[PDB]
Write a protein that binds this ligand. Structure first.
Ligand code: RET
Length: 226
């Protein structure tokens, strides 16, 4: 009966619907290249759907003590993000033909961001929580710098239609991702200013927008076509 459950139920529903819709459209398409984008992009909200469900049912939540209090931390989010954020990057990476080393570096950075974020989430010394938060956000910025400067340049060599689709997704990604560290900062994991219920709502709106929103834009485009 935690108050944030209503948002966990809506994120479950939205992610589940989104998965089904993408699966249905995906299995209908025969183009090889398009099927690859569909397979990657249907997996993302799939993973998110299972995690939101678990949390809705009481899993992935633990009490961490810091600030002289017992604080409720949803660690199931990091298990979701660990695998969905690199898959989203792969989507963007395939669109622009990015180099294999570039992708290895991104995913690597991404592993670090999610890994330090979680360590930071679980840290019992208040001050140190933000030390882990800082590194994680530093890793995040590296990724955004690459997608904005690096990937946009590679996109330049693709047809206009492919480059156009990437810019939209690149913008969607940049705007949504940069909002996660601030939410963590002022929410349950950080300053404890925004309450967990509201925080769950914020992450749900970002999550769904970043997965199903991102998906709808990518999968409805001509750009995934070989
Ligand atoms: C579907 C989920 C997506 C697209 C999640 C993106 C998540 C981020 C960009 C998260 C970033 C974080 C930081 C920069 C620092 C503190 C902890 C995190 C993990 C909340």
């Amino acid at each position: 009966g935690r108050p944030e459950w209503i948002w966990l139920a809506l994120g479950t529903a939205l992610m589940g619907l989104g998965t089904l819709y993408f699966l249905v459209k995906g299995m209908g398409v025969s183009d090889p290249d398009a099927k690859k984008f569909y397979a990657i992009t249907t997996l993302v909200p799939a993973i998110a759907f299972t995690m939101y469900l678990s949390m809705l049912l009481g899993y992935g939540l633990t009490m961490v003590p810091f600030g002289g209090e017992q604080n409720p931390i949803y660690w199931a989010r990091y298990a979701d993000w660990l695998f969905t954020t690199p898959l989203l990057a792969l989507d963007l990476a395939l669109l622009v033909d990015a180099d294999q080393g570039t992708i290895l570096a991104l995913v690597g950075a991404d592993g670090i961001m999610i890994g330090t974020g979680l360590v930071g989430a679980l840290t019992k010394v208040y001050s140190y929580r933000f030390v882990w938060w800082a590194i994680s956000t530093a890793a995040m910025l590296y990724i955004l710098y690459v997608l904005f400067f690096g990937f946009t340049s590679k996109a330049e060599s693709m047809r206009p239609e492919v480059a156009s689709t990437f810019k939209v997704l690149r913008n969607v990604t940049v705007v949504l991702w940069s909002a996660y560290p601030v939410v963590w900062l002022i929410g349950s994991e950080g300053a404890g200013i925004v309450p967990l219920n509201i925080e769950t709502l914020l992450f749900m709106v970002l999550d769904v927008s970043a997965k199903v929103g991102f998906g709808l834009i990518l999968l409805r485009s001509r750009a995934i076509f070989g």
